[PDB]
Design a protein around this ligand. Structure first.
Ligand SMILES: Clc1cccc(COc2ccc(Cl)c3cccnc23)c1
Lengths: 141, 142, 146, 144, 140, 146
């Protein structure tokens, strides 16, 4: 079920400057989620990273995916009345290609286990893989 | 032709954050037309104020994005006057047709009409192949 | 002669930092005209980008200022629809004459021309001044109640 | 003489979001300076002070007068080629009236003493909205 | 544990970002003394302005932080006056001794002198060292 | 001493506000280990969005923090290459044990494992502490010299 940006902030507690999901285009509960984060020069981190070369910081690509991952969790089982999810561990992260101003970062997250929730995440720009995440781990606290 | 990425955009335009609204230039023909894009993310400083309860890209910011793209065109068309500080002099016939929202790609084209400094240009911006804004005439001064 | 202060403007308008650009409303007549001001300070977030070597108020933000003021008038002329989300639908005949600089007071007047409850079509003209002298002219602003 | 913001930036090292003089309207070397700071809703401190009632922080009023005091010093004597001035002391500050968005804060600073090249300048300062005193300062002391 | 973490400070002070300058209250004695801290990081908004080539914490922001700390003590000392919007009315005998820099832990103590109309003293330390003295902060 | 203060950090790292997350280097030994710290203040811009109701230091930023300290060690161990623009190639074995909060001092250690300046390729391990106690652990941080 497709989601525009007002409804994301109803699920997630993240606000500016640390909401890194712009749209949710496809979601299947307990299974997968697809979404995007538009990379514009008009974002606050870009001045710091870097003055002479504007490149999306890798860690913020993790955060992006992790957030989209967390939307899936909250919409797969919100029985625990808590939207405050905390990153507990992350493993097998590979950055292949610089994400630059102008790109669309398309993102896919797959639920492995919900016991502590564990997920994987891929990031595409132009159908080409830019980030890989073997395993994001999350523990609503 | 060749794409002018952002680092090279900042070498042409004097605009900086939080008022640089052109992310990439995909095609430019000197003295004629220019196509650019602006990626609209929730991670932009203006969104918290427009509006807290419904994030919509201010319409005047779309004009500003288009007028900056038009400005790139002018400076590469004739830099004989190597002053990059161009000021908006007039704008005419602006119609916004659809809300530009976070998640969108604002695709933009500007068209040089006349040039002498005084230059005139038309602008159009699209999201998903659909017209979001039209500008008959942007007028500019050196 | 109602004097409206930033807290009460924040009750009318859904705009917030950094895109609220009316600081005060000095005169308002419902269904007719509104006069207000915006103080122009170096200490605004837009000025670092426009421009590094020469701070000048972006003309579009002068458009926005006058629009927001105009939209105040609209919501105090007719709030029967309790929606405060007005979008810009069209603008026509905009002339910038003088540069608006840090230190200036931007006195603004918007006049209501037509108000159609058909589509939510309100139409307004707008003039901005610094020191009694015209800095911006707008022949027609068109707005759409969402 | 009147001084624009562009020239203010030539004299003062202060940059956004800590430059609090928008215009110098009258200056006399070695004696007195007059200047203004336009107070808009569109400043980054206003969200923090305070969400529910927007009041210009008093310490920022002190800063604004201090920056204006600073300009006068640098134009009264720039034999010391150093624009980086440090507040060393402040005495006799009184806030009378809340400074609000939409106000013009007109400021005046009066040089009291200058030790040329110990770098110790002393000055007084007053701030006004609408002809009415909003801030008094008995003595700013600076480390040049 | 006689202290107050950030979430609890925000229930006391109306101040928010970018003008909340107390991170943690480590000791407090009602009607007497308050000890607090503020961590000084390059990643703070004011440091780009002051100064581009030499990051120094604005002295007035040292005054503001101490005053904020003093403000918590007042309110926890007597909240019968049901108002958390305190205004600075005056400040006296402020002396800056040393620059405060990114990386320092600004440790601050404010001492209540008189109430009802509140007057207090303030001292700031980096590494035991006195960075700022305030003889008298006046509140109403 | 072996202490680099913020000014010298900014000569080594290209990072600026709001993405410079090493405040001070307290001990460094070239080609081996580095100890630095990041001061956690409520007066940082990320805290407003993470989270409104509960200010917690984004875990990812704790990675960046460590990686930037890792980078300082690499650029001082070997600056053969006239390039300070290090990109994160991959990260591995990250655990977050305890929330980092406004008021904490994040004390950080990164250790060099392997370096081949032939390619411009380095690997590092990292641990973050608050009050002597572990808050973050990182098995492997991999970085490219681009
Ligand atoms: Cl006109 C003006 C100028 C500067 C600061 C202020 C008020 O500062 C405060 C507000 C709220 C609280 Cl609860 C405080 C507490 C302590 C110190 N200052 C406080 C008023």
């Amino acid at each position: 079920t497709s989601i525009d940006i007002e409804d994301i902030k109803k699920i997630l507690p993240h606000r500016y400057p640390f909401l890194l999901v712009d749209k949710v285009i496809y979601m299947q509960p307990n299974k997968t989620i697809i979404g995007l984060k538009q990379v514009s020069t008009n974002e606050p981190f870009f001045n710091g990273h870097f003055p002479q070369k504007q490149i999306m910081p890798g860690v913020l690509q993790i955060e992006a995916l992790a957030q989209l991952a967390g939307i899936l969790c909250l919409k797969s089982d919100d029985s625990q009345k808590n939207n405050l999810f905390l990153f507990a561990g992350v493993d097998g992260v590979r950055w292949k290609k610089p994400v630059l101003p102008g790109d669309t970062l398309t993102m896919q997250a797959n639920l492995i286990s919900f016991k502590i929730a564990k997920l994987s995440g891929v990031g595409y720009v132009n159908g080409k893989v830019v980030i890989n995440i073997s395993e994001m781990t999350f523990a609503l606290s």
